[PDB]
Design a protein around this ligand. Structure first.
Ligand SMILES: *[C@@H]1O[C@H](CO)[C@@H](O[C@@H]2O[C@H](CO)[C@@H](O)[C@H](O)[C@H]2NC(C)=O)[C@H](O)[C@H]1NC(C)=O
Ligand SMILES: *[C@@H]1O[C@H](CO)[C@@H](O)[C@H](O)[C@H]1NC(C)=O
Ligand SMILES: *[C@@H]1O[C@H](CO)[C@@H](O)[C@H](O)[C@H]1NC(C)=O
Ligand SMILES: *[C@@H]1O[C@H](CO)[C@@H](O)[C@H](O)[C@H]1NC(C)=O
Length: 213
């Protein structure tokens, strides 16, 4: 299928807020800043659910985010590039340690098995992790995703960031209960850390005119 079930984040916007709350931890104790990145957005959320030889494709994107709805089966995500590709494979054991690999070879478009990493060589990342935080089902209360930059890949998992550095040419091509949010451009948010509690707000109109480049 192709990009079936087009919905906004709606009442689940708090997932985006939480993402920004974790992202902004690195800021100084006394600052008011506007952060711009390929942040998860609010409009293009998809649930393409229209045989294990079929898959969904996407093109020309720079970051990919997804969420877990709350029958539970499996997810397969491939980000193409050269010499390295990124593959994420999940398994039905939500309370035990999905796998993420960054390697050299040719990932499959579909997977029938589980938790392996033999599609390539000279790997930089080979990491096993639980699908649900703290092995509980506390699941579907945060976003997961990838941002692929030429210099490094940053993986967002369980509120934590994993940064894997290596030179790579990335392609915008991506091959895929789970909801997805393709990200194509930069979104700006204002973060106020003066109060003692960080406050995250949208920057879309008059302030946007001062930061949007
Ligand atoms: C940032 O803008 C989005 C809209 O693009 C706001 O999202 C709305 O949030 C309310 C309350 O959660 C929902 O009822 C609406 O359905 C949302 N509309 C959407 C998703 O388009 C969001 O609340 C704004 N955030 C801030 C801090 O202003
Ligand atoms: C999803 O809806 C938006 C409007 O909110 C539209 O611009 C976009 O092209 C739609 N995408 C698909 C695959 O229907
Ligand atoms: C991420 O933010 C959430 C929501 O604010 C918070 O509960 C959690 O402790 C944070 N996790 C971190 C610091 O990685
Ligand atoms: C954050 O601001 C609100 C008012 O909008 C205030 O009630 C709250 O106590 C402040 N947080 C802290 C840690 O002071």
């Amino acid at each position: 299928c192709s990009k079936f079930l087009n919905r906004t984040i709606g009442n689940h916007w708090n997932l985006i807020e939480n993402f920004l709350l974790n992202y902004s931890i690195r800021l100084p104790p006394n600052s008011d800043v506007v952060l711009g990145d390929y942040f998860p957005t609010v409009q293009p959320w998809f649930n393409c659910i229209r045989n294990n030889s079929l898959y969904v494709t996407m093109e020309n994107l720079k970051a990919l985010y997804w969420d877990y709805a709350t029958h539970r089966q499996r997810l397969h995500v491939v980000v193409k590039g050269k010499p390295y590709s990124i593959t994420v494979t999940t398994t039905r054991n939500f309370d035990a340690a999905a796998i993420i690999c960054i390697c050299k070879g040719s990932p499959p478009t579909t997977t029938t098995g589980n938790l392996d990493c033999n599609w390539g060589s000279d790997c930089r990342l080979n990491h096993k992790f639980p699908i649900c935080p703290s092995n509980s089902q506390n699941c579907g209360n945060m976003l997961y995703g990838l941002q692929w930059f030429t210099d490094e890949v940053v993986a967002y998992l369980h509120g934590a960031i994993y940064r894997i550095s290596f030179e790579n040419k990335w392609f915008g091509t991506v091959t895929l209960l789970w909801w997805f949010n393709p990200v194509y451009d930069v979104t700006y948010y204002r973060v106020n850390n003066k109060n003692g509690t960080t406050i995250v707000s949208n920057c879309t109109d008059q302030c946007a005119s001062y930061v949007d480049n």
